[PDB]
Coordinates of C-alpha atoms and ligand atoms in Angstrom, one line a residue:
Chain A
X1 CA 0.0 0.0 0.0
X2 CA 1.2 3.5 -0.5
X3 CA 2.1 5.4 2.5
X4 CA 1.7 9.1 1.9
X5 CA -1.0 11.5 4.1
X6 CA -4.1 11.0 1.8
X7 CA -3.6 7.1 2.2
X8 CA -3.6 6.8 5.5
X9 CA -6.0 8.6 6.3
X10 CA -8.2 6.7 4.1
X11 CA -7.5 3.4 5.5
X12 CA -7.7 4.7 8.9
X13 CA -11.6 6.0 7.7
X14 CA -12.5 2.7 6.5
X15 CA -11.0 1.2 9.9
X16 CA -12.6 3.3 11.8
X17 CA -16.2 1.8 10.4
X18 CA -15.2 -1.2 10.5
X19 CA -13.7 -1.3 14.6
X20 CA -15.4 2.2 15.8
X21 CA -13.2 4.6 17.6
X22 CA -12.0 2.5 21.0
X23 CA -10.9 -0.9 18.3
X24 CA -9.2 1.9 16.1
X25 CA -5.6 1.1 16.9
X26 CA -2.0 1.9 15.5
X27 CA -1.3 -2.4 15.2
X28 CA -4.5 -3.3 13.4
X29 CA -3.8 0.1 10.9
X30 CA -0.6 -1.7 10.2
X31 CA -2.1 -5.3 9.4
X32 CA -4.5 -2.8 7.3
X33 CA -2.0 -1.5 5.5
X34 CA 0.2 -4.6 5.0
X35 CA 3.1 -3.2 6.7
X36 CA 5.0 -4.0 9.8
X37 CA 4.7 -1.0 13.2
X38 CA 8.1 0.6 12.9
X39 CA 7.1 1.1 9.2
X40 CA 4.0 2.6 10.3
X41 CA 5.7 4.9 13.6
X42 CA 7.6 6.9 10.6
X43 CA 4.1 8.4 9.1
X44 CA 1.6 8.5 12.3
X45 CA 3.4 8.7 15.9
X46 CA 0.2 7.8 17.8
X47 CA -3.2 7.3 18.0
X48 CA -4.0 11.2 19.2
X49 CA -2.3 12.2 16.3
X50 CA -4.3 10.1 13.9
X51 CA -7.9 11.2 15.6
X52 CA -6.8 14.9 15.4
X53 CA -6.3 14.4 11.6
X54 CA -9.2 12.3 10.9
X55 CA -11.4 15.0 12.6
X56 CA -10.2 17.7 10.2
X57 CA -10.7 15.4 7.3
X58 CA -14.0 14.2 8.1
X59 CA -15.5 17.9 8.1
X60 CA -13.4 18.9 5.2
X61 CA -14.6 16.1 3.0
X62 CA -18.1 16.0 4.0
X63 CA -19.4 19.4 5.9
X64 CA -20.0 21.4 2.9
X65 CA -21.4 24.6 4.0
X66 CA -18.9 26.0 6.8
X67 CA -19.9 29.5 4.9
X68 CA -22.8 31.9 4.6
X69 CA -24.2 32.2 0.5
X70 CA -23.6 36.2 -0.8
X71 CA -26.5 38.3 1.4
X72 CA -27.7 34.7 3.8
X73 CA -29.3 35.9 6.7
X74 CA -27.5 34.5 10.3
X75 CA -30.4 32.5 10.8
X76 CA -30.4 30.2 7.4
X77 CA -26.8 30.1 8.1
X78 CA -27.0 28.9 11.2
X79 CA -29.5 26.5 10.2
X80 CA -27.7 25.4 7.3
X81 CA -25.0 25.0 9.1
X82 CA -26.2 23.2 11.5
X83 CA -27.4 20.6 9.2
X84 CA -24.3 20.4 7.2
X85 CA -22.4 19.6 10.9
X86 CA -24.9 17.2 11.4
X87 CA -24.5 15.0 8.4
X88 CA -20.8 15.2 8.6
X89 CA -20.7 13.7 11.7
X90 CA -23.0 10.7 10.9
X91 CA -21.0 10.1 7.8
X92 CA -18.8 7.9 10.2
X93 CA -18.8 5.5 13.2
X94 CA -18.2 7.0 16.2
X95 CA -17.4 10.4 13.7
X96 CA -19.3 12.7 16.5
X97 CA -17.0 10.8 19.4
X98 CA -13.8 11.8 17.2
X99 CA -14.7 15.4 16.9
X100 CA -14.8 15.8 20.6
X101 CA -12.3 17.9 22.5
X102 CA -11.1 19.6 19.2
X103 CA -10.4 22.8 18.7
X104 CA -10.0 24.5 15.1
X105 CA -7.3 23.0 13.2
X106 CA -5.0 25.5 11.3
X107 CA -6.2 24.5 7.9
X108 CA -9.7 25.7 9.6
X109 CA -8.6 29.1 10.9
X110 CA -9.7 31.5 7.5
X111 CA -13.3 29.4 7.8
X112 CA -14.2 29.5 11.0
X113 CA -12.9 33.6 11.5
X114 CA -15.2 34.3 9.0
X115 CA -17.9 32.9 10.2
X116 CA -17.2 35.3 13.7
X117 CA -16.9 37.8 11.4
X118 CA -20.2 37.0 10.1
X119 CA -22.3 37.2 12.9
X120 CA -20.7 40.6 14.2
X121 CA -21.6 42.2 11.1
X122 CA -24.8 41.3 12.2
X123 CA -24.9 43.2 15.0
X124 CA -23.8 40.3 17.8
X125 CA -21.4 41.3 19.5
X126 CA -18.2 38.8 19.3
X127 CA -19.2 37.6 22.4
X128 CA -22.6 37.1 21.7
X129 CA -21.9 35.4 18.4
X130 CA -19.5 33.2 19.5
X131 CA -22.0 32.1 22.3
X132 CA -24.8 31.5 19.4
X133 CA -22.4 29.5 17.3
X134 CA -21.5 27.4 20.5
X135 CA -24.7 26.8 21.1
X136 CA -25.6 25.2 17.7
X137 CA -22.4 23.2 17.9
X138 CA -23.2 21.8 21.4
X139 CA -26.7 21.5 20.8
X140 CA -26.2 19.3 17.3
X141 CA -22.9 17.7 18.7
X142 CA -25.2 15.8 22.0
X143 CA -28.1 14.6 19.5
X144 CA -25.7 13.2 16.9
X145 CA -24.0 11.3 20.2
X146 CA -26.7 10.2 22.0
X147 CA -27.9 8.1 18.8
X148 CA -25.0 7.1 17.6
X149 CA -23.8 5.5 21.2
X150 CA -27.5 4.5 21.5
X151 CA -27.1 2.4 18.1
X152 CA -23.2 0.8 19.8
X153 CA -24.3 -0.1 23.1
X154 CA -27.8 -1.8 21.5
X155 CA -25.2 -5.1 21.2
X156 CA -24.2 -5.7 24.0
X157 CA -27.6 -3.9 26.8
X158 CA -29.9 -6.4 27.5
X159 CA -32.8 -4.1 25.3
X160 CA -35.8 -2.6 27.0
X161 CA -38.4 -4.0 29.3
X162 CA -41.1 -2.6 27.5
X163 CA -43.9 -4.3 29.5
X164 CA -43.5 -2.3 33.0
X165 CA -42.9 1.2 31.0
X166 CA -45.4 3.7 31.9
X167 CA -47.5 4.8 29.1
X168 CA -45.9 8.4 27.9
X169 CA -42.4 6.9 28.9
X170 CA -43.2 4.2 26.7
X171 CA -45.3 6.5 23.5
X172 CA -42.0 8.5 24.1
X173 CA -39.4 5.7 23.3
X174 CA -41.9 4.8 20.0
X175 CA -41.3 8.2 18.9
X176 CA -37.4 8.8 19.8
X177 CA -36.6 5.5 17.4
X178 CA -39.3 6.9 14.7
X179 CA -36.6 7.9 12.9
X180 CA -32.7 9.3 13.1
X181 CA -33.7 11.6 15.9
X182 CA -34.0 14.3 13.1
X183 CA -37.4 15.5 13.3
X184 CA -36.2 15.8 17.2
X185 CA -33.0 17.8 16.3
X186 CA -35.0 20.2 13.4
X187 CA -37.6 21.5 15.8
X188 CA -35.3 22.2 18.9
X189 CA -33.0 24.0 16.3
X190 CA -35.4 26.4 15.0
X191 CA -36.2 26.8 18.9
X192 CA -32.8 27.9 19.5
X193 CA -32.3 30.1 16.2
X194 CA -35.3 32.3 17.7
X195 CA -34.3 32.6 20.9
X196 CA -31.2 34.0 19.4
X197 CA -33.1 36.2 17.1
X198 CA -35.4 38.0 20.5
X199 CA -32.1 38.2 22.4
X200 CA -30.8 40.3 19.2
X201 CA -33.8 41.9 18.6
X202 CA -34.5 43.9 22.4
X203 CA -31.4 45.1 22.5
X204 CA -31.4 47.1 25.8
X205 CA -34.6 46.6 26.2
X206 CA -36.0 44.5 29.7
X207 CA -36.7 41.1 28.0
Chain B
X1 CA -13.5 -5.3 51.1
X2 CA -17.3 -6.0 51.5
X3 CA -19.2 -7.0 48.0
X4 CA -22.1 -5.4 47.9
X5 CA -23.2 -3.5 45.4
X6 CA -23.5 -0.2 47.1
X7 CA -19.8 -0.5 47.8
X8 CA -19.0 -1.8 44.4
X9 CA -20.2 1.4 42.7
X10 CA -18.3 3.8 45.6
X11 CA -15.5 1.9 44.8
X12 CA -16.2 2.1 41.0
X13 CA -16.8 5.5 41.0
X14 CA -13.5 7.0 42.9
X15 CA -11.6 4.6 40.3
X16 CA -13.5 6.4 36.9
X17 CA -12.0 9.4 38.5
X18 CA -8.4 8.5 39.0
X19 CA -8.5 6.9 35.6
X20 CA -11.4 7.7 33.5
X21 CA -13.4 6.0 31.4
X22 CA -10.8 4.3 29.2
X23 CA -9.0 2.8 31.9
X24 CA -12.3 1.2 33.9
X25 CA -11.7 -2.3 34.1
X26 CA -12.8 -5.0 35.9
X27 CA -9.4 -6.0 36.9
X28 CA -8.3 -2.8 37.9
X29 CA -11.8 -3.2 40.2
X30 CA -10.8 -6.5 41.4
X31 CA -7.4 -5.0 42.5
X32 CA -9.1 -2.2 44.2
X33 CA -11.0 -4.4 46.1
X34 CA -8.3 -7.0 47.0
X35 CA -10.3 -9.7 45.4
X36 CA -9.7 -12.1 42.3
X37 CA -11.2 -11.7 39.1
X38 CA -13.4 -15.1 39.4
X39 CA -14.7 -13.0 42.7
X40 CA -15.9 -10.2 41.1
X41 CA -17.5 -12.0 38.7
X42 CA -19.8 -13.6 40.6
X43 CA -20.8 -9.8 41.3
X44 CA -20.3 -7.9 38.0
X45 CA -20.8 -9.5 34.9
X46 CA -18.9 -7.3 32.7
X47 CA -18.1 -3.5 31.9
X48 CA -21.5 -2.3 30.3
X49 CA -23.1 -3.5 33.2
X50 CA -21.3 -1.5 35.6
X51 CA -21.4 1.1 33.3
X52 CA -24.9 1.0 33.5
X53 CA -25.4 0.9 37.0
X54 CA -22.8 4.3 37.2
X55 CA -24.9 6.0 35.2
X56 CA -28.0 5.2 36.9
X57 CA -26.1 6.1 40.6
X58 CA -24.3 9.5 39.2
X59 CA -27.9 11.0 38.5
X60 CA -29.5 9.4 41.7
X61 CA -26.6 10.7 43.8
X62 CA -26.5 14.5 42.5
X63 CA -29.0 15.0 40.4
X64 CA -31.8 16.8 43.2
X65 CA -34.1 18.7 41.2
X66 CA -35.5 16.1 38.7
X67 CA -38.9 16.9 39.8
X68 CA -40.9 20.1 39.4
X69 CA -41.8 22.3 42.9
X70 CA -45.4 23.0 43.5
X71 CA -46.5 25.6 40.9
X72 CA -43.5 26.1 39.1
X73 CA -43.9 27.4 35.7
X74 CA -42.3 24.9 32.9
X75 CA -39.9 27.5 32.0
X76 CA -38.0 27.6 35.7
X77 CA -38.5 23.4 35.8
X78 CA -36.7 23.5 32.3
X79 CA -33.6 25.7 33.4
X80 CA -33.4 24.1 36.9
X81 CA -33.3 20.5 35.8
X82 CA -30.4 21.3 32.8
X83 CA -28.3 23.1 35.5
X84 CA -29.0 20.2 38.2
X85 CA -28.5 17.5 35.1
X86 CA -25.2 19.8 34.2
X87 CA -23.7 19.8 37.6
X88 CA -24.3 16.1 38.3
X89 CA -22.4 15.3 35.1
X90 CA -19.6 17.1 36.0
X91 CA -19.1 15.9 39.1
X92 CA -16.9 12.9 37.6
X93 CA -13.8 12.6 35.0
X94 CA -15.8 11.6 31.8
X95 CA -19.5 11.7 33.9
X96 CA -20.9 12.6 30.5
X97 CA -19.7 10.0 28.1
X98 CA -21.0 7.5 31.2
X99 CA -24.8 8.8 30.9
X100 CA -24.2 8.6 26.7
X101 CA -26.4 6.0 25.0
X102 CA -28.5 5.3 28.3
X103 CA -32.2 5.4 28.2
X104 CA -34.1 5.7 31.5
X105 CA -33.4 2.7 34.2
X106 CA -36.4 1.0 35.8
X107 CA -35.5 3.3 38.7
X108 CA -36.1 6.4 36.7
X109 CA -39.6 5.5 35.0
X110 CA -41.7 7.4 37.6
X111 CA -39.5 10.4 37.9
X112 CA -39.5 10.5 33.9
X113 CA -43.0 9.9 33.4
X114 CA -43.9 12.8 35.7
X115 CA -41.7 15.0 33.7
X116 CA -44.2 14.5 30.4
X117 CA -47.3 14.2 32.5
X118 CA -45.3 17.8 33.4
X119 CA -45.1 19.1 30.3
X120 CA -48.4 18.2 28.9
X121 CA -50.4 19.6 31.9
X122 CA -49.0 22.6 30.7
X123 CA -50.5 23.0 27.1
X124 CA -48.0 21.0 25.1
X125 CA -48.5 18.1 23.4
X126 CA -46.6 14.9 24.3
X127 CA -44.5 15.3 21.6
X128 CA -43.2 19.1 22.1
X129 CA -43.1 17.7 25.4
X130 CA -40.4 15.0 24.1
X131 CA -38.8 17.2 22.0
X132 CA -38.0 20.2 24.2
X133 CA -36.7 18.1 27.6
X134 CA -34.6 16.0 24.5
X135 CA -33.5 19.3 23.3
X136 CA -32.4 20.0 26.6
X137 CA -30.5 17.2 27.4
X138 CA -28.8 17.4 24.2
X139 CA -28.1 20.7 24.6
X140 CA -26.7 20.1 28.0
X141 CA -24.8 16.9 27.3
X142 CA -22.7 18.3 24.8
X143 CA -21.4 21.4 26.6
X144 CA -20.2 19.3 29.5
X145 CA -18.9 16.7 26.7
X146 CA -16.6 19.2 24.7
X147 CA -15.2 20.5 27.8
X148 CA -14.3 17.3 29.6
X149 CA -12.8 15.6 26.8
X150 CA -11.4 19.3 25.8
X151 CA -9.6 19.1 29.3
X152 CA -8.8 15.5 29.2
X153 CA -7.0 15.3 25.5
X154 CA -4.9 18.5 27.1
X155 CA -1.8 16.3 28.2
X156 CA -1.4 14.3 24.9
X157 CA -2.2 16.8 22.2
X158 CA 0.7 20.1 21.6
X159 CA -0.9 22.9 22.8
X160 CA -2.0 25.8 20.6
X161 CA 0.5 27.7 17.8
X162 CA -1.8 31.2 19.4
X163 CA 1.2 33.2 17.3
X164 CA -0.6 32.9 13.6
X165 CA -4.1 32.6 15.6
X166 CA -7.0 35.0 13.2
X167 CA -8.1 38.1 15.8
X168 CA -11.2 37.1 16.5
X169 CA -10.8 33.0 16.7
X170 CA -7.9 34.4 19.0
X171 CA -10.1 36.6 21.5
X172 CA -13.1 34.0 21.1
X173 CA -10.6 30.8 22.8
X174 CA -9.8 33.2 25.2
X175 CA -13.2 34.0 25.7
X176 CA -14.2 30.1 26.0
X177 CA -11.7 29.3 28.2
X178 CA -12.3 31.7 31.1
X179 CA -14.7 29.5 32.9
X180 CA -16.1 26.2 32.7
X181 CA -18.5 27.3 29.9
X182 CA -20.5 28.4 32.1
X183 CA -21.5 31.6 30.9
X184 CA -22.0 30.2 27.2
X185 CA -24.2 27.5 28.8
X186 CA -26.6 29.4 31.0
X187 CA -26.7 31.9 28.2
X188 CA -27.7 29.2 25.4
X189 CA -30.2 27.9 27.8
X190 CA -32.4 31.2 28.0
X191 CA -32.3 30.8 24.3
X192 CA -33.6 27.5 23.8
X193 CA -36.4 28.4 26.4
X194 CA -37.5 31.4 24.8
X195 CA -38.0 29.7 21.6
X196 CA -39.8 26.5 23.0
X197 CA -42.5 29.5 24.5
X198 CA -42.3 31.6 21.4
X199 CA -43.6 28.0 19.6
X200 CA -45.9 27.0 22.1
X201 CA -47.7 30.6 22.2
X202 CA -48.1 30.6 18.7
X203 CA -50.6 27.9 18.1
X204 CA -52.1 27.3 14.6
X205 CA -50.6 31.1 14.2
X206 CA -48.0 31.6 11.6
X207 CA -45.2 32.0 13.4
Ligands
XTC1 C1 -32.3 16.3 32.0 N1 -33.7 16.1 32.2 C2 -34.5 16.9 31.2 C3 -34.2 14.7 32.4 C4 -33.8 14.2 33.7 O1 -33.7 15.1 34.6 C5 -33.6 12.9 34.0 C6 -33.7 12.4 35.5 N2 -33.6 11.2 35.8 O2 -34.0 13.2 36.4 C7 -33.2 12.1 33.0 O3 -33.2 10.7 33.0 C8 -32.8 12.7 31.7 O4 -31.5 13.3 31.9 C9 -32.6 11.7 30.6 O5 -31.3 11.2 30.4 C10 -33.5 11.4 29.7 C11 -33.4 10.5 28.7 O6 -32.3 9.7 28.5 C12 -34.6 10.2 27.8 C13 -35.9 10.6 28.2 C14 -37.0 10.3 27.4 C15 -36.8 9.6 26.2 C16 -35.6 9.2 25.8 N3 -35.5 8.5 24.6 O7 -34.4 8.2 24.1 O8 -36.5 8.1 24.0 C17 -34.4 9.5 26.6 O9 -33.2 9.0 26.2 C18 -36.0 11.3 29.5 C19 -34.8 12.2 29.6 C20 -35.1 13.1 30.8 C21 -33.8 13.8 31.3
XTC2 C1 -20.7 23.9 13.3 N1 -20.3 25.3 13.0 C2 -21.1 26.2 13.8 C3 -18.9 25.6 13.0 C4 -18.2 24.9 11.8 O1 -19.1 24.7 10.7 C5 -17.0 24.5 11.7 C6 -16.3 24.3 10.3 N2 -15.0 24.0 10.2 O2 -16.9 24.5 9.3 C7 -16.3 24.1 12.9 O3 -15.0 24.0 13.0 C8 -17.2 24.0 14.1 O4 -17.9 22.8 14.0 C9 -16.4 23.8 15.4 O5 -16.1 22.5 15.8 C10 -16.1 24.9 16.2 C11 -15.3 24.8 17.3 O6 -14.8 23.6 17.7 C12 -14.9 26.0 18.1 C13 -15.1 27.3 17.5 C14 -14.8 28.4 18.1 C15 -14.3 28.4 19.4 C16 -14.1 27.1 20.1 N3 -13.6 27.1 21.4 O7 -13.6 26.1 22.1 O8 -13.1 28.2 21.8 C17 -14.4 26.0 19.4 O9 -14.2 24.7 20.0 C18 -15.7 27.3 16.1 C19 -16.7 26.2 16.0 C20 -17.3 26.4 14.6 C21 -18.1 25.2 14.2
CL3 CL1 0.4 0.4 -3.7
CL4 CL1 4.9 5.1 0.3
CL5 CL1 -14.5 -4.9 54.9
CL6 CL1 -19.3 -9.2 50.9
MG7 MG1 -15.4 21.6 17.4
MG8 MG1 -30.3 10.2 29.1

C-alpha cells in the first residue's frame, strides 16, 4: 500500500467503520495496510495524532457549507450549518466521538474567522456570536451522540423491558426511534435560532 | 473489602476518577477491592453492566431537582433541571460520556414519566413535550462533553500555535476558556427556552 498522508487517512476512515473509535488502533492500521509498526511509527506517531487528523478530514470532506451564500441571513446560516455539521458527523462510526475535544485545526482558521466575522456584522457582538455558534455546535454535537452511542451499546444492553414502561415513557421511546432523531433535532434548532433572534432583537430593552 | 453493590459502585466510581473512562476495568476493580477476578464475577458481569449501574447512581446521587416544585412554571423546571442535570455530570472525570447512550433505568420511570405528564399539563403536546426536555439534554450533554474531553486530550495533544491565531478566533478561545463554559451555557439555555415558548404561544398562528 502507499504510505503518503491522503492514504492513511483513508484506511484509517475505513478502519474506523469497520472497529469504531475504542478498536481503532496503531497495530490493526498496520495489518490494514500490510506493513509491519516501525514502518507505520515513521508516518503517524500515535493514535491522538491520527484522531486529530481524521477530525479535520472528516468535516473537510463532507461538511460542505462551513460558509454563509452572498446576502444569507445568520439565521439560514446557522440552520444550514447546523445541518451540514450534522450530516458530517453521521458520515462515520463513532465520527461525532472523534470530533470531541477539538479545537479549530489550522487548515480551519480562514473558515471558522469568517464565520465570527459574520455574525458581528450582524450586530452580535463577538461575544454574543460566538455564544450562538456554540450553542448550535453543542446542541447538534449531543443529538448526533446520544444516537450514535444508543445504536453501539444496543449489542451488548440487554434491550428494554417494555412491558412495565409507563405509558408516555413508553409512546416517548416509539417516537425517539421513529426515525434518526431528526425530526427531534430540526424542531429544537429552530427553537434555538429564535431565541437567538429576541435576544438580538431587544437590545437594551428588559426582555 | 465488603461486596455489595452499594460499595461496588463507591468503589467504582473513585476509580473512573483516578483513571477515566478508558482505563475502567474490571481488573483494575478487582485489585481495588483486593479480590480475584473469578470473585468479582460472581458480582459484576462485565463493563456495560457496571457502566450501567454508574450511570443510573451519578444522576441518583446529584441530580436533586428532577422533579418540578409546586406551581412552578415549565420555563423555571426546564432551566433548573439542565443546570442540576449539568452539575451532576460534572461531578466525575468523563461523567458525560458514562450517561451517553443510556435510556431511562427501571428506577427512573416514575421520575421520567412525571416530567411528560409535566409538560403536557402545561398546554403541550406529548410530543413538544419529548422534544423540548430532549433538546435540553442534548443541549446540556454536549457542553459538558466538549469540555471534559477538551480538558482531558490536554496532556497528549501540543498545545496551541496562538502566534498565527485569526483576531477574532484568538479573542473567542480566550473567551471560552475563562470559565467552565458556564456563561456560554446558561446563556444558550435562556435561548432555547424562549423559543420553545415563542412555539408553544403561537398555536395554529404563523409563526
Ligand atoms: C435532564 N432532564 C431533562 C431529564 C432528567 O432530569 C432525568 C432524570 N432522571 O432526572 C433524565 O433521566 C434525563 O437526563 C434523561 O437522560 C432522559 C433520557 O435519557 C430520555 C428521556 C426520554 C426519552 C428518551 N429516549 O431516548 O427516548 C431518553 O433518552 C427522558 C430524559 C429526561 C432527562
Ligand atoms: C458547526 N459550525 C457552527 C462551525 C463549523 O461549521 C466548523 C467548520 N469547520 O466549518 C467548525 O469547526 C465547528 O464545528 C467547530 O467545531 C467549532 C469549534 O470547535 C470552536 C469554534 C470556536 C471556538 C471554540 N472554542 O472552544 O473556543 C471551538 O471549539 C468554532 C466552531 C465552529 C463550528
Ligand atoms: Cl500500492
Ligand atoms: Cl509510500
Ligand atoms: Cl471490609
Ligand atoms: Cl461481601
Ligand atoms: Mg469543534
Ligand atoms: Mg439520558
Amino acid at each position: 500500500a502507499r504510505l503518503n498522508r491522503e492514504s492513511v487517512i483513508d484506511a484509517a476512515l475505513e478502519l474506523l467503520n469497520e472497529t469504531g473509535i475504542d478498536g481503532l488502533t496503531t497495530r490493526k492500521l498496520a495489518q490494514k495496510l500490510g506493513i509491519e509498526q516501525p514502518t507505520l511509527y515513521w508516518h503517524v506517531k500515535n493514535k491522538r495524532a491520527l484522531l486529530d487528523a481524521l477530525a479535520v478530514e472528516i468535516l473537510a470532506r463532507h461538511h460542505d457549507y462551513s460558509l454563509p451564500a452572498a446576502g444569507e441571513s445568520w439565521q439560514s446560516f446557522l440552520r444550514n450549518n447546523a445541518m451540514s455539521f450534522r450530516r458530517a458527523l453521521l458520515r462515520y462510526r463513532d465520527g461525532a466521538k472523534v470530533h470531541l475535544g477539538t479545537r479549530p485545526d489550522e487548515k480551519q482558521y480562514d473558515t471558522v474567522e469568517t464565520q465570527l466575522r459574520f455574525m458581528t456584522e450582524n450586530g452580535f457582538s463577538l461575544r454574543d456570536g460566538l455564544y450562538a455558534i456554540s450553542a448550535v455546535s453543542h446542541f447538534t454535537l449531543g443529538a448526533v451522540l446520544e444516537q450514535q452511542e444508543h445504536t453501539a451499546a444496543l449489542t451488548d444492553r440487554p434491550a428494554a423491558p417494555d412491558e412495565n414502561l409507563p405509558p408516555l415513557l413508553r409512546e416517548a421511546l416509539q417516537i425517539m426511534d421513529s426515525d434518526d432523531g431528526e425530526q427531534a433535532f430540526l424542531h429544537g434548532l429552530e427553537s434555538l435560532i429564535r431565541g437567538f433572534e429576541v435576544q438580538l432583537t431587544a437590545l437594551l430593552q428588559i426582555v
